[PDB]
Amino acid sequence: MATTRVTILTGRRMTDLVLPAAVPMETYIDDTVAVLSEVLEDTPADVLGGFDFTAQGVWAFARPGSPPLKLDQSLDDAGVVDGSLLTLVS
Amino acid sequence: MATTRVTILTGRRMTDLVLPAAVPMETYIDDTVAVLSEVLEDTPADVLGGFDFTAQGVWAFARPGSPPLKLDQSLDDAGVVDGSLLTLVS
């Protein structure tokens, strides 16, 4: 399985992940959010810039400050390269 | 976020995955199965040894031939190390 290294920015915190490169983002985004919520459960809120893992609505990846990537596309389709910064948006 | 590379056995096929080592298995197993479903979607049926992605219960990881690991535990809790062989069972 091809993979890509991405770093998720949550406020000031960076978290490095290894994600499937060629599978649509919709296939794994929900459990990604769930994992990151556990990983950052003890992190102070001011450091997370108030980030809410319990936000309602449809989660997607986005390059910081940009419109969200299409969930039916893979990271490869979206041109995401190793070490790219992404955010989680809903 | 700690990770451990595991080898998932499906029939005669072995597929390496980098999984979160420190969060409960139940946090990511469902999307792991979904991802693996896409990755192995062109694998010939005889290589798959009757492995079925259609669940007969709640999915769990298991060391081949052993009782399934508890979903509330992490890979670390289960003593899983790099290149540990695991299967998916329901």
Author numbering:
A (entry chain A), B (entry chain B): 20 to 109
What does the paper say about this structure?
The ESX-1 type VII secretion system is an important determinant of virulence in pathogenic mycobacteria, including Mycobacterium tuberculosis. This complicated molecular machine secretes folded proteins through the mycobacterial cell envelope to subvert the host immune response. All ESX gene clusters contain at least three or four ESX conserved components (Ecc), named EccB, EccC, and EccD, with EccE being present in all ESX systems with the exception of ESX-4.
EccD1mt (Rv3877) is a 54 kDa protein containing an ~110 amino acid (aa) N-terminal ubiquitin-like domain followed by a 30 aa linker and 11 closely spaced transmembrane helices at its C-terminus. We grew crystals of the predicted cytoplasmic domain of EccD1 from M. tuberculosis (cyto-EccD1mt) which diffracted to 1.88 Å. We subsequently solved the 1.88 Å cyto-EccD1mt structure by molecular replacement using the EccD1mt segment of the MBP fusion protein. Interestingly, the asymmetric unit of both crystal forms contains two EccD1 molecules and in both crystal forms the two EccD1 molecules are arranged as a head-to-tail homodimer stabilized by an extensive interface. Dimerization of cyto-EccD1mt creates a wide open-ended groove bordered on two sides by the α1/β3 loops.
